[PDB]
Every structure is written in structure tokens, then in C-alpha cells.
Design a protein around this ligand. Structure first.
Ligand code: NDP
Ligand code: NDP
Ligand code: NDP
Ligand code: NDP
Ligand code: MTX
Ligand code: MTX
Ligand code: MTX
Ligand code: MTX
Lengths: 268, 269, 267, 268
């Protein structure tokens, strides 16, 4: 049976890329998404096209809140349902890629109590709390699975950020969530090491800029990166993921790989 | 109208919080001792302190876990945290130093042997990270909401973190995650509040006053692991770094974490 | 024409594993060595047996000391000469892997001759040599007319994942690796213009010495969080092939650990 | 009983001079080392001696990794031992060591020999190799001192650089030497904790800028520092040294304190 892989935020951009790659490597993918249901399916189509039954599409709000079912469903629940939506269909889940991520200002000063305490649940859920549970569910299912019938390449990859050291002004929560994630990587790696589950992170610097920001803006940004003076492509990033998941890196765990074109070496 | 500096120390009830608060009080600060369940010890401290200097200490109970408390609508962590910064302004009309000391410290295995989780997820992250976030925020605004002329001259925020978070203690994943989120907060906060001359740093203890209940045999096991003096640090040693960062001897220091581990994080397995 | 890779200390153990791996990817390899002449040749033999003129050898003490000849040859000279050997023979040098490394105690607390020499040896092979080498290497890429340059210049520095937790008694060694780490980031930033990536691979525990009592060996391997065993040479070399592969072309000035989680442990 | 001795290298001017003074005013008897500023060394020695008789001396040595003329040429190590010897041979004690002396100039990889070989020795020598030796000489004396005749506060302090994670373009040799000095700090701290010798580093960001640097150059550097938009004074740096040597930091070892004003928190 082919290896299965869950990729949160597989709808568009990077997550979309990481999924294909894993698919191309011969992985049945569980394409996760939040708002974009179009792309999440447009993709699954193409994927199943290329190879019959090789891509499903689970949907879930990964923010740290509760959605209506009688009792509301916590974030833990929703998460434990994804990992669960795999063993249910393909009977296995070998690779998890916490990609899903909210990213926007959370200033400390100014120029709405709730906008914040909802962003907190947002930024902190997608980037850190959700990954914790996901990693936990994934780790249990393997634990439960009998020794004799376990996969041989369980790999977990959290998508962090290579610039958190030099915090992006005004993005406090995001930054905390991210560094909270790195800790998750390290901690997960050490503990889950026994079940032979690897946990590593990929720290992109300036990858595919937001489909939103203008051109003059993207220019100003990509021109700050030392290598090539351009942001990375979805590929230059996903390769690091497929590499981390391939056997060519089976002795690697609890580590983060920067893919920033030397961006983190620059100073103001 | 000179008036004495105010310091808000969360978890100032006992152990390190108490040491830090007493240390600050001793330097001349008036202190708002926050606590959660140690109502009696916090009162004892305050008592001791107000006997030395009248009206130089007050207490404030408040659960820093990221949940809501009963009041019309229940009260959110955000709100409760604003109440704290406000206590100082309401009582002394100022707040110059904040020390995020309050921290829940317990295991949260990824494997088996529910609700226990969701509470620990709100308790560990709220106390060690989210609460510190709202506090630094509220503390920062008041500074801004204050006239350039009536502004203190030594605003200092100190986040109590962990020096061993790089070598994750087995089983404490959320705590570890939270401590490092707190590190991000330290760096991020420092960068963003520089403009208001509010310094933000962290004190990273290795092994200080060991947990209250852990037995002798278990403790002395931990002491032989510290390269320097083969012991854990006293409270006075940890709190001494805290007074340093709040003194004008450190005014140009911000966004940094000072280790007080005795070399412990240099050791390998 | 086929890519060239210069691997210092490629005589045995890991360098031998890295050299052989690059060779497999199609790289033509220059196997430098210091004392291990026998092993280096045996390897060049095997490699040139799988493909004619796919490997050559070069001997050089990378210790920061002056050598024989007329006038003494500085470490710089030997270094630059090492790079020129690749250009003289295959007319191109694309990958440089600083692997050569002296590794032994230099206790702070106790003659002095021993010290002056450990300093030159330990800092020579781990930092000074790598510097000069990178420098000679970059010079060549620069002196090449834009049109003729290679499309994949990659430099990889072999460092250590346990430098943050100093191995008691190896100060000079630890100091040198830290300098090697600095070299990686500094060179990386300064060579980005020339499209020359500079990265590091930091193993934790791999192919233990050789003169390590099986008791002592099994000691260390039960300390490793993943598989409770040290790594293989191949597990460290896969990282090098990856860093030089085009699938890492946007990576530079970074270090990738291959410790199996060993650096995540405390005492 | 006696006054603590503090050996400060390159203590003739700037930061060094500020440290020797700060240490002196705390009660320490200081040994002012210099390379070329023999004049400044003297003005300072006179001043420190005027406030207190025989409370400071000067010692000249080239901390660069090159031999000098006396029978045989003197190695860097010899000179380093002579620096510590000087302290014991005058006060019978050496309690504090501040590795402040440091060469700092470009060593560009690309063209634009003997010019490098001398630079390599000077840079690495002063910034890393000498410090290793001075620490060694300093440590052996304590070791060859009976447990009871030992002081109650051995404190070594190395002046490092908070901006090495973001290498100053063109200064590779310098940057490596500092990283080396950083390793020295961690390693020496671990191996000297048994002798109760604390070893820490002070990481300045922008302090007394190198002179002959046009006002406009200095001003455009300061405007980059998040806090106060100015470089620090020498006092703001020495204040951190005096703290590390105080019993207020008696449990602190193997760490580096930044005094950069957040400048290392920024990004390009
Ligand atoms: N792109 C870059 O330049 C960089 C990216 N990174 C990291 O890479 C990872 C992916 O980045 P990038 O590809 O730009 O991200 P995308 O911007 O392409 O967004 C990924 C998405 O995951 C989903 N998501 C967002 N919030 C939530 C939530 N609360 N619950 C559930 N799902 C949510 C969304 O799905 P949607 O389809 O459903 O609505 C969102 O579009 C992140 O962890 C990011 O921080 C780091 C540095 C740089
Ligand atoms: N001492 C040590 O060995 C080490 C300490 N540290 C860090 O130092 C700081 C203090 O450590 P230490 O002195 O041991 O801590 P203590 O064990 O002092 O506990 C601090 C306390 O703050 C309060 N608190 C905990 N959870 C909550 C919550 N959810 N809401 C409100 N208040 C809460 C509690 O109050 P309570 O009395 O009022 O009810 C608790 O006693 C922490 O940040 C800790 O993580 C790091 C490494 C080691
Ligand atoms: N082994 C491990 O588990 C670990 C390895 N590393 C790093 O990986 C790399 C390879 O380590 P490992 O495989 O054990 O190394 P070995 O390769 O043990 O030795 C490499 C060699 O390079 C050469 N060399 C040593 N000193 C000098 C010198 N002064 N001048 C010139 N050449 C010299 C020698 O050549 P010789 O044969 O020709 O004469 C020596 O055999 C190193 O950089 C090491 O620091 C890091 C952590 C762990
Ligand atoms: N100034 C700043 O803003 C920053 C400083 N730092 C660190 O602070 C420390 C002091 O910096 P700064 O105050 O600018 O230094 P100074 O520029 O004041 O120079 C210190 C000196 O020590 C001596 N010295 C230098 N090279 C050698 C050598 N090869 N042999 C013997 N003596 C030598 C010289 O003595 P001389 O009088 O005798 O001839 C030299 O003037 C350094 O370690 C530096 O790396 C880090 C970041 C920023
Ligand atoms: C790559 N970089 C793009 C980018 C695109 N999507 C992402 N998505 C996630 N989840 N995480 C990221 N780190 C991320 N990064 C950036 C960097 C800064 C700003 C930015 O600052 N934007 C503000 C303006 C700046 C401000 O708040 O001061 C805006 O909303 O227009 C935008 C994109
Ligand atoms: C200093 N060190 C003590 C200590 C005391 N109070 C604190 N309080 C806070 N908020 N944060 C800390 N880091 C902290 N640390 C430690 C380290 C590990 C264990 C520990 O592992 N305890 C488990 C046993 C181990 C396990 O879960 O495997 C138990 O509950 O008995 C306890 C105290
Ligand atoms: C993987 N590890 C092996 C090892 C093998 N070759 C290497 N070669 C190089 N160039 N670099 C390395 N880091 C390296 N590491 C180790 C670690 C510690 C000791 C060790 O401490 N050996 C002393 C004993 C310990 C002591 O000095 O206290 C001895 O010479 O027997 C040996 C091998
Ligand atoms: C604080 N900062 C000053 C400064 C002054 N003295 C020092 N002295 C020592 N020993 N160490 C330092 N880090 C140091 N730093 C700086 C930073 C960069 C340049 C600089 O780049 N100078 C070149 C110009 C730039 C280049 O080579 O591209 C020159 O010589 O004019 C100078 C001073």
C-alpha cells in the first residue's frame, strides 16, 4: 500500500506545491483547507486524474475556537479528525506537514477588544496549537498500530519562519506562534523519537510573496535577498520538504532547514 | 510630586516571584503583588512590606489561564490582564516595571499511559505567553496614553523564561512551546516598544529553587548536574539579574535573555 | 564537461563517503589527503575504475604552518595550489567540501610546543585552511568570464552539532568549528553575488573514531534519541549531495544537523 | 586582606579604558595592558594611581599570533603568560580578566598574500588565540593556588560582538575570530566551573564608534539603533562588565549579554 500524507493548507500557493511533490513521489495526499474550497478541489481533481484515488479534501477551521456540531467541537477534536480521516480512508498516515497559517498584524501600540482575542485564537491556533494536536493524534495512531505493521518512514514537518529572530514589526503574535512552533518541533522530535517519528522544520525567508501585495512592493522585498535578489519559488521550498521526508534524511530530526537565500544574514 | 516607581510582579506570592518583588521593593519601588491561589502568602508578603514602608505593596488575585471568569458578561483573560496594569495606575497612578513571572509548569505527554488537555492548553499557554502578551500591551498603551512630560524614565519589562528550552525537558511540550513563544514576545515587544523607551528582556534560569514538593533524593540528583557549584541557584541569584535589568546600569539593554543556569545548558546527555 | 568537487581529507571515513557520493552523482572528484596516502590512492583507483579520469589525489598539510619546497610555502599557498590543481587538471572547480579536521583534547588545566602546535593544527584544518580555500575558490569563479561560469557553485563546510554543548576538554577544537560556522555565514553572504552558495553540515555522532573501545562506542550510541545509534557515513554524505543538488539552490549560509536529536538532550 | 586584581587587555582607550576605570572605581587594582598606546596607558595609570597609590600598572605586548624578539623569539603564548605573571608578580593575585583588545578591519574574500597572512594572525591572534592563552594562564594560577588561598570570585569576561549572526560584509576573518571567542566562552565556562571561574561574554552593538568616521557616517549608523537611535556610551558597556564581575552574577557563567539596543533585532 502507498504512503499517505496529510498537508494542512494544501489549497493554494506553497501547501499546494508541497502536496503535489509528495504525490509525485508517490504519496496519497489528504489535502486540507479552510476557506478556499475551490482550489482545494480543483487540485484534488488533477491529482486523482494523474493517479486514480490519490487525493481527498478534508476541511476544518484550525483556529483555536469551536464550531457547531449537540455540544460544539473544540480545536482538538477537529484536528484529531483529520489524522482520523486518513486511517478511515487509506488506513495509514505517514507524513504530516503543518503548513496552514494565519499571518497579519497584532500591534502592541496604535492610531475592538475582540478583534484581538480572536486573532489570538487565529494566529496561535493555525501556527502552534493546531500543530500540537495534529502531531499528537498522528503520534497516537502510530503508537496504537501494532509494531509488526508500522510504516517505515513516519515524518513530520512544521513550516516555520527563518526571520523570527529579527521579528517583523507589528507581527508579535505571529512571531510568538512561530517560535512556539519551533519548540514544538524540538520537543516533538525528542519525545516521539522512540516511535521512530521524525519531526523537522523548514524555515522559508521570502518565498512566494502574497498574491496580494503589489509589484513595487514585491520588488522592494525580493531585492533584499542576497542570493539572486529574488524571493523563492514554491519549488525551492517544497524540495526541502520532500528531501526531509525521503530516506536520504532518516537520521535527521529536531532540526530546522533555512531556505532564505541568505536573507537572515542581512542587517538593517 | 517626585513619587516612587511602581512594579507589577505576577506570581509574586512565593518562591521566585516573592524574591523578585522584595528585591524590587528594597530598591525603592512600590509593588503590586499578583497571585492566583496563594492568597495567604501574598498577604503575608504585602504585610511584611507595608510594615517596612507604608503603602508600598498591594495584592491582586487573577487567573492568568486563557479562559473566562464569571463577572454582566464573563471576563476574558484580556480584560483580567488590563485590570492588573490598571490596579497600579488606580492605586499609585503609574507602572514602570512589569515582570511576567507567573507560570504553570506540568507535563503534557504526546502519548497515553481529554479535557485535562484543553485546560492545560489554556493554562500553560495563557500564563506563560498569552497573559504576558496582554500585559505588555496594556502596560505599553498607558505609557503612550501618558504625556511625554509625565513619563517615567526607566520603563522596564522582564519576562521570566527558561534557559533549558533548547534541550526540551521530556514531556513538557506545551510549556516548552509557551516559554519560547514568550521569548518571541520578548524580542518582538522589545523591537516595537523601543520608540517609547520601554526595554524588554528576559531572565533565563536553569535550576533555581527546586519545586516545593520534590524530595531531597531527587533534588540532589539535579544539583550534581550543574557544572558551577553543583547546586541550583538561590532565589536571590535569579532576582539579582532582574534588578539589574531594571536599573539604569542596563538602560541600553533590550531584547535580550540573560542566563542564570550556572552552566547547566552547556552539558550534554 | 563534468562537474568537479574538491573534498579535503577525502582519504577515508566521511570524506571518503562524501567524495564517493559526489562521484556517483556524476562529479569528477579531487581527493585531498594529509597522511593517508595509501587509502586515498585505493579510492582514486576504485573511482577511476568505474570511470576513467574521474578522480585525482593531492597531499597537503592544512595545519597553519609554513612548509619546505626554495622558500617556505605558507598554508595559503598550499591551499590556493589545491584549488589550482582542480583547474589545471579538469579546468574547473564547482564544489568544495571542507572535511579535513584534526580532533583532540587541549585541556585548559594541565609542554608548551605541544600547544603552539595543537593551535596551528586544530585551527588550521578547521578554520584557517577552509578560509583560504574558499577564498582561492571564489577568486577562480570571479576570474572566469561571466559567460563561461558553472551553473551550480556549492561549498559545504563540515562542522559540529555539539558545539553549543562543548565537549569537555576540546576548547581549541570547539573554537575552530565555531569559526567554521562563522565562515559559512560570512562567506555565504559575501559570495551570493557570484552565485556561490555556502552551507554547513553538522553531524552529532557518526562513524566513531576507529580506536574507540566497543564498550565506549555502545556508550555514546545509547545516548542518541533516535535509533540509539550513531549515524552512518552515508547519512552524513546524503546531506552533502543534497546541498549540492539543484534541489537546494536557494539554500545558503545555513547549517543542517544530522544528529538524530542528540543535541536536544541535557545531562 | 586584599584588593582584587583585574587584568584588562587593550585598556588604553575607548571601551577598554572605560572598563579598567569602572573596575578600578569598584575597588579592583588593575593591570592596564596596551599594544601601541603607551602614552594613553600612562595617563590612565597616573590618574588611577593618583586616586589610589599603587592600584594600577601597565604592560605592553602584541597579542597578535606572531613571535617577537627577546634567547629565542617569544611566542604569543609566552607573552600571554607574562601578562598573568605580571599580575601575580606584583600583587600575588589575578581575580578578573577582561579580553577587550581587538583588531578590526576588512578581509574581503575577493581581490579588489603577505597582506592576508599578517591580517589572519593579527585578527585571529588578538580576538581568539591570545584570549585562549590568557585564560589558560589565568586558570592554571588558580589551580596552582591552594583551595584556601583562592579568591571568592573569579570572573573572566570576553568582549564579543552582537552583530556576528549578520556578518558585516567584508569582515570574514574578524567574524570568525569572534565566533571563536564565543566558543571559547562556552567551553572555558564548562571546563573551569570546577575551579569556580566564571566565564562570560559582553556583546556590544554600537558603542564609541571608531573615530575618524565622518559625523554623517556615525549619525547614519545610530539612526539604525531601535532604542534611543544612538550608539551606546562606553559606560553602558563597562556597566555590564562590572555586573558580571559582581557577586550579583555569581551564578552566571557561559552566557553572553547584549548591549546593542535591539540593533540585532532588525532586518534589512
Ligand atoms: N510565503 C512566504 O514567503 C513564507 C511562508 N512561511 C511559512 O510557510 C507556511 C505557508 O506559507 P504560505 O504558503 O505563504 O501560506 P498561504 O498564505 O498560502 O496560506 C496557507 C493557508 O492555510 C490556511 N489557514 C489560515 N489560517 C487558518 C486557520 N486559522 N485555520 C485553518 N487553516 C488556516 C488558509 O487556507 P485557505 O485556502 O483555506 O483559506 C491559508 O491560506 C506558513 O507556516 C508560513 O508562515 C514562512 C516564511 C515565508
Ligand atoms: N525555579 C526554577 O527552578 C525555574 C523557574 N523558571 C521560570 O521562572 C519563573 C518562576 O519559576 P518558579 O519560581 O519555580 O515558579 P513558581 O513555581 O513560583 O510558580 C509561579 C506561580 O505563578 C502563578 N501561576 C501559575 N499558573 C497560573 C495561572 N494559570 N494563572 C495565574 N497565576 C498562575 C502561581 O500562583 P500561585 O501561588 O499564586 O497560586 C504559581 O505559583 C517561571 O516563569 C518559570 O517558568 C525556569 C526554569 C527554572
Ligand atoms: N565522526 C563524527 O561522528 C563527527 C564528525 N564531524 C565532522 O565531520 C568531518 C569529518 O569527521 P571524521 O569523519 O571523524 O574525520 P576524520 O575524517 O576523522 O579525519 C579527517 C582528516 O582530514 C585530515 N586532517 C586532519 N588534520 C589535518 C591537518 N592538520 N592538515 C591536513 N589534513 C588534516 C586527515 O587526513 P589523513 O587521513 O589524510 O592523513 C584526517 O584523516 C570533520 O570536519 C568533523 O569535525 C562532526 C561531528 C561528528
Ligand atoms: N566599539 C564598538 O562599538 C564595538 C566593540 N565590540 C568589541 O569590544 C571590544 C573593544 O572594541 P573597541 O572599544 O572599539 O576597541 P578599540 O578600538 O578601542 O581597540 C582596542 C585595542 O586593543 C589593542 N589591540 C588590537 N589589536 C591588537 C593586537 N593584535 N595585539 C595587541 N593589542 C591589540 C589595541 O591597543 P592600542 O592602544 O594599544 O594600540 C587596540 O587599540 C572588542 O573586543 C570589540 O570586538 C563589539 C561590537 C562593537
Ligand atoms: C514574504 N512576506 C510575505 C508572506 C506571504 N504570506 C505569508 N503567510 C503566512 N502564513 N506566513 C508568512 N510568514 C507569510 N509571508 C511579507 C512580509 C511582510 C508583509 C507586510 O508587512 N504586510 C502589511 C504591511 C506592513 C506592516 O503591518 O507594517 C500589509 O498587510 O500590507 C507582507 C508579506
Ligand atoms: C527546576 N526543575 C524545577 C522547576 C520548579 N518550578 C517551575 N515552575 C515554573 N513555572 N517553570 C519551571 N521551569 C519550573 N521548574 C524541575 C525539572 C523537572 C521536573 C519533573 O520532571 N517533574 C515530574 C517528573 C518527570 C516527568 O514528567 O517525566 C513530576 O511531576 O514529578 C520537576 C522540576
Ligand atoms: C563522535 N565522537 C567521535 C569523533 C570521531 N572523529 C572526529 N573527527 C573530527 N575531525 N571531528 C570530530 N568531531 C570527531 N568526532 C567522539 C567524542 C568524544 C571523544 C573523546 O572524548 N575522546 C578522548 C577521551 C575524553 C577526554 O579527553 O576527556 C580520547 O582521546 O580517548 C572521542 C570521540
Ligand atoms: C561600531 N562599528 C564600529 C566599531 C569600531 N571599533 C571596533 N573595534 C573592534 N576591535 N571591534 C569592533 N567590532 C569595532 N566596531 C563599525 C561598523 C562598520 C565599519 C566599516 O565598515 N568600516 C570600513 C568601511 C566599510 C567596508 O569595509 O565595506 C572603513 O574602514 O572605513 C566601521 C565601524
Amino acid at each position: 500500500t502507498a504512503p499517505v500524507a496529510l498537508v494542512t493548507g494544501a489549497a493554494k500557493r506553497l501547501g499546494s506545491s508541497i502536496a503535489e511533490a509528495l504525490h509525485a513521489e508517490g504519496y496519497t495526499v489528504c489535502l486540507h483547507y479552510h476557506r478556499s474550497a475551490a482550489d482545494a478541489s480543483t487540485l484534488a481533481a488533477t491529482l486523482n486524474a494523474r493517479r486514480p484515488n490519490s487525493a481527498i479534501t478534508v476541511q476544518a477551521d484550525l483556529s483555536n475556537v469551536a464550531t457547531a456540531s449537540s455540544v460544539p467541537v473544540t480545536l482538538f477534536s477537529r484536528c484529531s479528525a483529520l489524522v482520523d480521516a486518513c486511517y478511515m480512508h487509506w488506513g495509514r498516515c505517514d507524513v504530516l506537514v503543518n503548513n496552514a497559517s494565519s499571518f497579519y498584524p497584532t500591534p502592541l501600540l496604535r492610531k475592538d477588544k475582540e478583534s484581538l482575542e480572536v486573532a489570538a485564537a487565529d494566529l496561535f491556533g493555525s501556527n502552534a496549537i493546531a500543530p500540537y494536536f495534529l502531531i499528537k493524534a498522528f503520534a497516537q495512531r502510530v503508537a496504537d498500530t501494532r509494531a509488526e505493521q508500522r510504516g517505515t518512514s513516519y515524518s513530520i514537518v512544521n513550516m516555520v519562519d527563518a526571520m523570527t529572530s529579527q521579528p517583523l514589526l507589528g507581527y508579535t503574535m505571529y512571531t510568538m506562534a512561530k517560535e512556539a512552533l519551533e519548540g514544538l518541533t524540538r520537543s516533538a522530535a525528542l519525545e516521539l523519537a522512540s516511535l521512530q517519528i521524525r519531526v523537522n522544520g523548514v524555515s522559508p525567508g521570502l518565498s512566494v510573496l502574497p498574491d496580494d501585495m503589489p509589484f513595487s512592493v514585491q520588488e522592494d522585498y525580493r531585492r533584499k535577498v542576497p542570493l539572486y535578489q529574488r524571493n523563492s519559488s514554491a519549488e525551492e521550498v517544497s524540495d526541502v520538504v520532500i528531501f526531509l521526508c525521503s530516506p536520504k534524511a532518516k537520521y535527521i530530526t529536531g532540526t530546522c532547514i533555512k531556505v532564505d537565500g541568505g536573507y537572515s544574514l542581512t542587517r538593517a
